[PDB]
């Protein structure tokens, strides 16, 4: 009837260390965010950073 | 553009119901499943015979840090410490000191194997291609201590491999 | 490759497909592992002239968020034009 | 935009969010403090704390806004500001393919009536905020420590909380059970002072305050 | 600017009110949590553990915070009642492994540079 | 009109056997619930304009097929849902009273980005 | 040239040599210290000095891109053979 | 009063007559890039890095030595000013030897950080470079004269502040070198101060050399004890030990200069 | 302006009990502020504009192994940021912490005249540029 | 590999052909999956009509991707909000009718076929161009330029000490993950 999916059993304070590291050192955190579709996480981080930077990636 | 998936309609005619009734009674899609596995039984396996057969890799493989040396003999690391600053896990511990000759040389170069992540950032850091990730993965250990590498182990790893990693960066520095 | 003829027709029949046309193990179609030197191209702005950073400085081009309303006839408008209904894929219209 | 380095700007929708921002601003001027858009076509309208119900109820139900996809419930600590905790909502409009974002200000103690009614997605997010930042929310169905450890102390993403933490764990033979001793690091986090003392961007520079 | 929004405690008494049944439930809670969790702790020192926790923080006078520990203490109790917390979590309050930190300036001096 | 569809394309939402006159009567509902709002209020001047218009093209052609592209609201069955949502708002701010001015300016530099 | 301590403990090029009184020497029995026998100080010492007749000599260090940045070496000090900070290869100015 | 209002890049602010442009820029907060100009030291106007374009002028005005007039718009972010900034910045950087990993100024180099903000993203130099003989003076301060940008800050902080004739600018043009000509050993009590005034690693501290780098250090401030002055200083603990001493600016006690016996 | 059963809180806010820091780490921790002095080797100034919350340094014993600086001071690595000292102390008092003050290092007026560097009866003439 | 400002390294020589070798045969293995799972009555009766979720309930719960598309909801990030070059490529969005575990399972395997289509177009659309932006303040300069020019030396040095100076602000750049 009622379900409670308790979580935290793997929890790592990912963005807590993200604050102390810079963007490049922050990139491996994203690859370890989803351990199934890793480079898709890389895609989200790279798009976000270069969106702030007002710089677009080359077509290649 | 888009496309449905579960929009097939079952036909109510005498023919169509017969196949469905035959499928339910005489299990055919189950037998179809059986045929798929059986055809795979007669399919050759793809089991690499470790250790005698070893999986393929690429000249860019990252693992088992090892300081290199110049063709003269002097080690590459000038203690520029970009690897230390870059290292996203802070596994690198470098302390510099002016050597008796005058040029720098790290008196302490410990990279903690169980803090490192083998991201390959450290080779991209030092402009003298001092530290690189070699092709080794066969350094599993039984005590946590031997994983904690130091300058002496790093140099010994470099002298041990060197030649293998000498060609690796020769076939990859064009890409970099 | 490998296998013999009578085995192939056995697995061809049991799977209802021609597995010999394309398999799931690489035999000879794999590209040669050693490759010629990869001469890479250069950047689009790689030029000795008229390439000052005064032109391309995207980090600088960014403007603080343009404020419109602050605490200190008309017509209704939408955040964006309403989306349009996609048509069935003309390749596979019905699975 | 012949140069390929910088990303091109898009003005047609850029004016559209600002027009929609004023459209929202005029309707409910009791709760909208200020609204603005950035270069990367991202509009943000700022609401008052007690405004979590109607503003989202607006965006969730309006025939011309209809923002129903709740994106994320984030918080951003700013120790300088008195209301350091800044609860941030984020909504996506399915029909109008846009991303609204409303954020408020809140102290450590001051509550927010739970917005699980407008979006039940916030309910599970709401647990994290009190775990992760610690801001309690009023009349919440079940607001639980769900992502941090059992019986944790404090709020780790308060910027006053050490990265390493306060308690470390180990298995102890004399009790045959894991005991939480105070942390004692093998190596100290070698902080890096990474701030060039020259002006970074003259655009976003803070004038003499 | 002294006038601010309250959570539940409109006054001190309601803050005093919520502390009351919180201890009423928690006082009724100590004997069984030991019993089910197989803790080798007698009921008595379980009960007054809740006691000195209760006045380890019963010094602040702001009505907005006192009820925040009430709900914090309220839900630390909820997590215990339904076997969510384990042996390590219940014992964790019962500090065992660390030696007593120094009491006299002689003991502060002898340990190290720490104050 | 035409043949009544069997699926709306979304589970849960079913094809309405009474498409237009149902939408019309609930639309007259959202004309009248809006009545007890003062005219100077912005939501009125937005709504009755958007109200009194799409009450037009529904009665402009009773057929279901053309009216899907009159309002760009997709299939009519979800327009019933969304117009009902607009009805919900008119009831909601009947008690919100969201037209007197902004409650209080934000505490000093409460946005101030960067810091 | 690796050198040994009084307790048979070979020293590293950094100069570390744990004394007998050091309790941290007990991990060393039954096991060994890895010593880079190629002491980095004396595989550069035996390398000769090249003779180039210029006031400034590039110091790429061979290998083209595979080496160290081409820091230019000043060569006018008669009493000091100008060596590169990166690679340590001593360069010399013909004896006038 | 005689205060003169100047509409610097728009915003208009009063200022005393005779005040140079930089003081007006920093009055708003415009940290104008500079190399050869330090607050308590004579003006050189040499690096040409502080070139900013003034309104209604066909030429870019050397803001370093130039006083402000009655009403002026300092084009801080204009293309002409940035073009002037870019031209001279790569000019200084052109003959600069490629030893950032080797030079101790790495991470505390003005020539590095300035190029990050006010600089290009590539090079246009195809010819060779120039290498300078390292002048040897002092067992306490190290000279790598190939890295020198000839800002002459050392010679002015010597002759005015230290009040001692020690260094020169021997040579001419590209071959003019900062040094002592005849060999010496500059020996002032405050001799360990030119290390900090040097914008590049041309002059560095011998004992601290090759020992620690900026991001590792966690600066902690204190005062000097070696003298009764009590000079405010900055300690540079890296991992549990002191590397170098910096002269914390406080004006009255020590300004931002400390003698050798303290650093 | 916010009338919903507001309580007239006349006592200074003390949120120290909620954050649950250890008791030895709230009293035996001197907490200090100042605006960083510019790195004297770097003429750049865009860092001496913010106040920060930094603490007192505890002991740093060398590791028995290779020699990392093992520390047991969790609060040491807690450099915060503050726009103004008034906001800095506001954080300090809100979680009441033994604190001290420090005044913003303000520059003085550099009376600069390049025409002074050359003179006839004035001694500020410079011998070499 | 994918870093802010392009992609770190370039594609090794010949790898694009190997991708074609894999892609040409991967369609067969998915026919093997669908035959093994989709048709079998055990897979359906155990998984179909299980865990249904209405469209309004699904979306208002904050669900996304296969949660929405499988359960009737007509929405996909690439088609609607085109990020990167995903607009140029063509594909189909396999939405479902009912929206149970089975319908989601079929939605996943049809996206697999659609993924093959996107692979086919982009692999044949490979341009002549560089792998990272031509801005050394965000992208590391080439290793050949690393040891040749001073600007490249500084730019890589500073980029590898502190990184790059990102202009202030905030964003919610969101793309669809395969989940
Ligand atoms: C049951 C069916 C009858 C017995 C097995 C028949 C069999 O294996 O036939 C060969 C062969 C094996 O399967 P395949 O996939 O065609 O083999 C592909 C390669 O040739 C396989 O390439 P390969 O390199 O494996 O070829 C060499 C292989 C060749 O191996 C054989 O020919 C198997 C018999 C060896 C004796 O021999 C070895 O590898 C040496 C090690 C042998 C291991 C132990 C074999 C035990 C066999 C049974 C013993 C009694 C029980 O099958 C056929 O040729 C047709 C199918 C079997 C027809 C049987 C008569 C009706
Ligand atoms: C050497 C070893 C030799 C034997 C190898 C194994 C043979 C048996 C397994 C494979 C059989 C053929 C596989 C195949 O084509 O399957 C799909 C096919 C077709 O599956 P289908 O699900 O596509 O059905 C299509 C036909 N309609 C639509 C009308 C239902 O399977 C069959 O045709 C099976 C027929 C026989 C089924 C008998 C079941 C009852 C048995 C009772 C006891 C006797
Ligand atoms: S691979 Fe990455 S984590 Fe490992 S040592 Fe190198 S930089 Fe550090
Ligand atoms: S980055 Fe390379 S050169 Fe620099 S210290 Fe590390 S190993 Fe040595
Ligand atoms: S002084 Fe020159 S070599 Fe040293 S860090 Fe600065 S730019 Fe690099
Ligand atoms: S040595 Fe240093 S201070 Fe002197 S002129 Fe050269 S760069 Fe300037
Ligand atoms: S700093 Fe003004 S010219 Fe050198
Ligand atoms: K210097
Ligand atoms: Zn060299």
UniProtKB/TrEMBL annotation, chain D:
- Catalytic function, reaction form: a ubiquinone + NADH + 5 H(+)(in) = a ubiquinol + NAD(+) + 4 H(+)(out)
Q: Which GO terms describe its cellular component?
A: mitochondrial inner membrane; nuclear body; respiratory chain complex I
Keyword NAD present in the record's keywords: the answer is yes
Q: Which domain of life is it from?
A: Eukaryota
Start and end of every NADH:ubiquinone oxidoreductase 30kDa subunit domain? Answer: 47-166
Per UniProt, the keywords (alphabetical) are:
NAD, Translocase, Transport, Ubiquinone
> What GO terms are given for molecular function?
NADH dehydrogenase (ubiquinone) activity; NADH dehydrogenase activity
Q: Localized where?
A: Mitochondrion
Which function does this protein serve?
Core subunit of the mitochondrial membrane respiratory chain NADH dehydrogenase (Complex I) which catalyzes electron transfer from NADH through the respiratory chain, using ubiquinone as an electron acceptor. Essential for the catalytic activity and assembly of complex I.
Family membership noted in the UniProt record:
Belongs to the complex I 30 kDa subunit family.
What this protein is called in its record is NADH dehydrogenase [ubiquinone] iron-sulfur protein 3, mitochondrial
| Organism encoding this protein | Sus scrofa
From TrEMBL, chain H:
Q: Annotated Gene Ontology MF terms?
A: 2 iron, 2 sulfur cluster binding; 4 iron, 4 sulfur cluster binding; metal ion binding; NADH dehydrogenase (ubiquinone) activity; oxidoreductase activity, acting on NAD(P)H
- The answer to whether the entry has keyword Transit peptide is yes
UniProt keyword list = 2Fe-2S, 4Fe-4S, Acetylation, Electron transport, Iron, Iron-sulfur, Membrane, Metal-binding, Mitochondrion, Mitochondrion inner membrane, NAD, Oxidoreductase, Respiratory chain, Transit peptide, Translocase, Transport, Ubiquinone
Q: What is its main location?
A: mitochondrion
Task: Kindly provide the name given to this protein in its UniProt entry.
Answer: NADH-ubiquinone oxidoreductase 75 kDa subunit, mitochondrial
Residues binding [4Fe-4S] cluster 1, per UniProt: 96, 100, 103, 109, 201
Which cysteine residues pair off into disulfide bonds? 151-154
Localization of this protein: Mitochondrion inner membrane
What are the residue boundaries of the 4Fe-4S His(Cys)3-ligated-type domain, all occurrences included?
80-119
The protein's organism comes out as: Sus scrofa
Q: Which family does it belong to?
A: Belongs to the complex I 75 kDa subunit family.
Gene Ontology CC terms: mitochondrial inner membrane; respiratory chain complex I
User: What does the function comment of this entry state?
Assistant: Core subunit of the mitochondrial membrane respiratory chain NADH dehydrogenase (Complex I) which catalyzes electron transfer from NADH through the respiratory chain, using ubiquinone as an electron acceptor. Essential for catalysing the entry and efficient transfer of electrons within complex I. Plays a key role in the assembly and stability of complex I and participates in the association of complex I with ubiquinol-cytochrome reductase complex (Complex III) to form supercomplexes.
Annotated binding of [2Fe-2S] cluster 2, by residue: 36-37, 47-48, 50, 64
| Presence of the UniProt keyword Transmembrane helix in the record | no
Q: Which residues form the 2Fe-2S ferredoxin-type domain?
A: 2-80
BP terms from Gene Ontology: ATP synthesis coupled electron transport
Q: Where does [2Fe-2S] cluster 1 bind?
A: 35-37, 46-48, 50, 64
The 4Fe-4S Mo/W bis-MGD-type domain, residue ranges: 217-263
From TrEMBL, chain I:
- Please list every transmembrane segment annotated in the UniProt record, as residue ranges: none
**May I have one GO cellular component term?**
mitochondrial inner membrane
Q: Which GO terms describe its molecular function?
A: NADH dehydrogenase (ubiquinone) activity
What keyword terms does UniProt attach to this protein? Electron transport, Membrane, Mitochondrion, Mitochondrion inner membrane, Respiratory chain, Transit peptide, Transport
Query: How is the protein disposed in the membrane?
Result: Peripheral membrane protein
Tell me where in or outside the cell this protein is found.
Mitochondrion inner membrane
Q: Is Electron transport found in the keyword set?
A: yes
**Which top-level group of life is the source organism from?**
Eukaryota
Entry keyword annotation includes Mitochondrion: yes
Please cite one Gene Ontology biological process associated with this protein: response to cAMP
Annotated segments matching region Disordered: 104-129
Family affiliation: Belongs to the complex I NDUFS4 subunit family.
The subunit structure is: This is a component of the iron-sulfur (IP) fragment of the enzyme.
What functional role does this protein have?
Accessory subunit of the mitochondrial membrane respiratory chain NADH dehydrogenase (Complex I), that is believed not to be involved in catalysis. Complex I functions in the transfer of electrons from NADH to the respiratory chain. The immediate electron acceptor for the enzyme is believed to be ubiquinone.
Name the record gives this protein: NADH dehydrogenase [ubiquinone] iron-sulfur protein 4, mitochondrial
- Residues represented out of the complete protein: 47 to 175 of 175
Automatic annotation (TrEMBL), chain J:
* GO terms for MF: 4 iron, 4 sulfur cluster binding; NAD binding; NADH dehydrogenase (ubiquinone) activity; oxidoreductase activity, acting on NAD(P)H; quinone binding
| Keyword Transcription regulation (UniProt) | no
The answer, when asked if 4Fe-4S is one of the entry's keywords, is yes
Transmembrane annotation, as ranges: none
Residue intervals of the NADH-quinone oxidoreductase subunit D domain: 1-179
UniProt keywords (A-Z) are:
4Fe-4S, Iron, Iron-sulfur, Metal-binding, NAD, Translocase, Transport
What's in the GO CC field? mitochondrial inner membrane; respiratory chain complex I
**Assembly notes:** Core subunit of respiratory chain NADH dehydrogenase (Complex I) which is composed of 45 different subunits. Component of the iron-sulfur (IP) fragment of the enzyme. Interacts with NDUFAF3. Interacts with NDUFAF7. Interacts with CERS2.
Which family is it part of? Belongs to the complex I 49 kDa subunit family.
Name of the protein in its database record? NADH dehydrogenase [ubiquinone] iron-sulfur protein 2, mitochondrial
Originating organism: Sus scrofa
